[PDB]
Enzyme design. Structure first.
Site, short mmCIF file in Angstrom:
data_model
loop_
_atom_site.label_atom_id
_atom_site.label_comp_id
_atom_site.label_asym_id
_atom_site.label_seq_id
_atom_site.Cartn_x
_atom_site.Cartn_y
_atom_site.Cartn_z
N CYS A 130 34.06 47.24 50.83
CA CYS A 130 33.33 46.11 51.38
C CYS A 130 34.40 45.48 52.27
O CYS A 130 35.02 46.18 53.07
CB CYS A 130 32.81 45.14 50.30
SG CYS A 130 33.75 44.93 48.77
N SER A 131 34.64 44.18 52.16
CA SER A 131 35.67 43.57 53.00
C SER A 131 37.02 43.57 52.28
O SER A 131 38.05 43.83 52.88
CB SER A 131 35.28 42.14 53.38
OG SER A 131 36.23 41.59 54.26
N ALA A 132 37.00 43.26 50.99
CA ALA A 132 38.22 43.25 50.20
C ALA A 132 38.26 44.51 49.32
O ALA A 132 39.32 44.94 48.86
CB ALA A 132 38.27 42.01 49.32
N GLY A 133 37.09 45.09 49.10
CA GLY A 133 37.01 46.27 48.27
C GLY A 133 37.04 45.94 46.80
O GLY A 133 37.62 46.69 46.02
N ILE A 134 36.47 44.80 46.41
CA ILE A 134 36.43 44.41 44.98
C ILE A 134 35.10 43.77 44.55
O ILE A 134 34.59 44.04 43.46
CB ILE A 134 37.57 43.41 44.60
CG1 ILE A 134 37.41 42.10 45.40
CG2 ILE A 134 38.94 44.04 44.83
CD1 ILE A 134 38.40 41.00 45.03
N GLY A 135 34.53 42.93 45.40
CA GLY A 135 33.31 42.24 45.05
C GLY A 135 32.09 43.12 44.96
O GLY A 135 31.63 43.47 43.87
N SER B 7 31.94 46.18 46.10
CA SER B 7 32.39 47.50 45.70
C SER B 7 32.46 47.56 44.18
O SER B 7 31.99 48.51 43.56
CB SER B 7 33.77 47.79 46.30
OG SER B 7 33.71 47.83 47.71
N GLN C 215 33.05 39.63 42.00
CA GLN C 215 33.61 38.34 42.37
C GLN C 215 32.90 37.07 41.96
O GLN C 215 33.40 35.97 42.20
CB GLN C 215 33.85 38.33 43.87
CG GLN C 215 35.03 39.17 44.28
CD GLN C 215 36.33 38.43 44.10
OE1 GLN C 215 36.64 37.53 44.88
NE2 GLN C 215 37.08 38.78 43.08
N1 LIG Z 1 39.84 34.59 47.83
C1 LIG Z 1 39.17 34.99 48.91
O1 LIG Z 1 38.07 34.54 49.15
C2 LIG Z 1 39.83 36.00 49.83
C3 LIG Z 1 39.75 37.40 49.22
C4 LIG Z 1 38.35 37.95 49.18
C5 LIG Z 1 37.69 38.34 50.42
C6 LIG Z 1 36.34 38.88 50.40
C7 LIG Z 1 35.64 39.04 49.12
C8 LIG Z 1 34.22 39.61 49.11
C9 LIG Z 1 33.32 39.13 48.01
C10 LIG Z 1 32.23 40.14 47.80
O2 LIG Z 1 31.13 39.88 47.29
N2 LIG Z 1 32.53 41.37 48.21
S1 LIG Z 1 34.21 41.36 48.89
O3 LIG Z 1 34.51 42.10 50.34
O4 LIG Z 1 35.33 41.67 47.65
C11 LIG Z 1 36.28 38.64 47.87
C12 LIG Z 1 37.64 38.10 47.90
N3 LIG Z 1 41.24 35.65 49.98
C13 LIG Z 1 41.55 34.92 51.03
O5 LIG Z 1 40.68 34.58 51.83
C14 LIG Z 1 43.01 34.54 51.22
C15 LIG Z 1 43.38 33.37 50.32
C16 LIG Z 1 44.86 33.17 50.19
C17 LIG Z 1 45.59 32.38 51.19
C18 LIG Z 1 47.04 32.19 51.06
C19 LIG Z 1 47.75 32.77 49.91
C20 LIG Z 1 47.03 33.56 48.91
C21 LIG Z 1 45.58 33.76 49.05
N4 LIG Z 1 43.29 34.16 52.61
C22 LIG Z 1 44.03 35.11 53.19
O6 LIG Z 1 44.34 36.11 52.54
C23 LIG Z 1 44.48 34.96 54.63
C24 LIG Z 1 44.61 36.15 55.48
C25 LIG Z 1 44.99 36.00 56.89
C26 LIG Z 1 45.26 34.66 57.44
C27 LIG Z 1 45.17 33.48 56.58
C28 LIG Z 1 44.79 33.62 55.17
#
Ligand SMILES: NC(=O)[C@H](Cc1ccc([C@@H]2CC(=O)NS2(=O)=O)cc1)NC(=O)[C@H](Cc1ccccc1)NC(=O)c1ccccc1
EC number: 3.1.3.48
Length: 296
Positions: A213-218, A220, A260
């Site tokens: 998916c986008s993160a490969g956990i939710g 997926s 997720q």
């Molecule tokens: N927690 C989140 O929402 C995301 C990871 C994430 C992204 C998408 C999902 C999706 C949920 C679903 O139903 N399917 S999925 O593709 O798994 C599930 C989790 N993580 C982030 O967005 C991070 C948060 C973070 C920021 C700083 C330190 C540690 C964590 N931001 C970033 O990773 C980021 C990336 C580039 C630029 C700025 C921030």
């Protein structure tokens, strides 16, 4: 598991059961993913593959890719959950599909979601515009595609320019599953999963299916939690013994954050339960799921 589903629903405790699960999940070293040279190979900083199950590319340069091997021993099936590739990791993505002998790719996300890019356009949209990844010496061509209402199945040709070899990769794209959301219905999801099963992509004669998916956990994690549970209650002497929470934790020993939200966990119970009809004997059910999915 159905009496449990009722118990939980009636109690309004999904957030609690789900929280218990998160709290209990495995915690393993993600050293390589954190290496400074792999920062641009990671889409999210809080989603990394465990060093023990991470997929290693077969290249001396840098064998890193944000992907995990979920080896469900009892169910006798393996999945590779990875993140939506990045502009600079598309060649890596296909190098792994090749090297891992995968037959199918299951995409449960859209390239753009909430106005934000969630995954690179890693496959050609027009047969005339094939893709060549110079870094991993691979060529990808779209041969045909069957567009349905909420998903598209594509026939791609992956060619390893180094070995001169050709392989047909089936692409299964679920296009109406929102981020942090759930399929529109148990039947639409089951109709899709079984669409993937009938092709042969999940067979042990092929490498592990690549699911992302986008993160490969939710999403997926959800796709895989449901498939693995249905596998277990078909080979288990007592179908009722399968514990979805316990199967999820097992999966989380291989990759973090599978499923997720509490609502995706709940939906997972609904899918498995419904899917159990087929598993327990009735052939008709699937034909009904298809009708309900309204793929046309
Ligand atoms: N927690 C989140 O929402 C995301 C990871 C994430 C992204 C998408 C999902 C999706 C949920 C679903 O139903 N399917 S999925 O593709 O798994 C599930 C989790 N993580 C982030 O967005 C991070 C948060 C973070 C920021 C700083 C330190 C540690 C964590 N931001 C970033 O990773 C980021 C990336 C580039 C630029 C700025 C921030």
């Amino acid at each position: 598991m159905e009496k449990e589903f009722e118990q939980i629903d009636k109690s309004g405790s999904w957030a609690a059961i789900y929280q218990d699960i998160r709290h209990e999940a495995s915690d393993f070293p993600c050293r390589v993913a954190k290496l400074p040279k792999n920062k641009n190979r990671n889409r999210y900083r809080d989603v990394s593959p465990f060093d023990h199950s991470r997929i290693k590319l077969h290249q001396e340069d840098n064998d890193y890719i944000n992907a995990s091997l979920i080896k469900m021993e009892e169910a006798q099936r393996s999945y590779i959950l990875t993140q939506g590739p990045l502009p600079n990791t598309c060649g890596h993505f296909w190098e792994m599909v090749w090297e891992q002998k995968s037959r199918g790719v299951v995409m449960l996300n859209r390239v753009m979601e909430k106005g934000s890019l969630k995954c690179a356009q890693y496959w050609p949209q027009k047969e005339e515009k094939e893709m060549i990844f110079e870094d991993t010496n691979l060529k990808l061509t779209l041969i045909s595609e069957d567009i349905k209402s909420y998903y598209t199945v594509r026939q791609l040709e992956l060619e390893n320019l180094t070995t001169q070899e050709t392989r047909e990769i089936l692409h299964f794209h679920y296009t109406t599953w929102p981020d942090f959301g759930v399929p529109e219905s148990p039947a639409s999801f089951l109709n899709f999963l079984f669409k993937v099963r009938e092709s042969g992509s999940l067979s042990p004669e092929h490498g592990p299916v690549v699911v992302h998916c986008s993160a490969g956990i939710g999403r997926s994690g959800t796709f895989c939690l449901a498939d693995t549970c249905l596998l277990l209650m078909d080979k288990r002497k007592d179908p009722s013994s399968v514990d979805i929470k316990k199967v999820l934790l097992e999966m989380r020993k291989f990759r973090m954050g599978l499923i997720q939200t509490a609502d995706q966990l709940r939906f997972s119970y609904l899918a498995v339960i419904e899917g159990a009809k087929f598993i327990m004997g009735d052939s008709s059910v699937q034909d009904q799921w298809k009708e309900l999915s309204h793929e046309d």
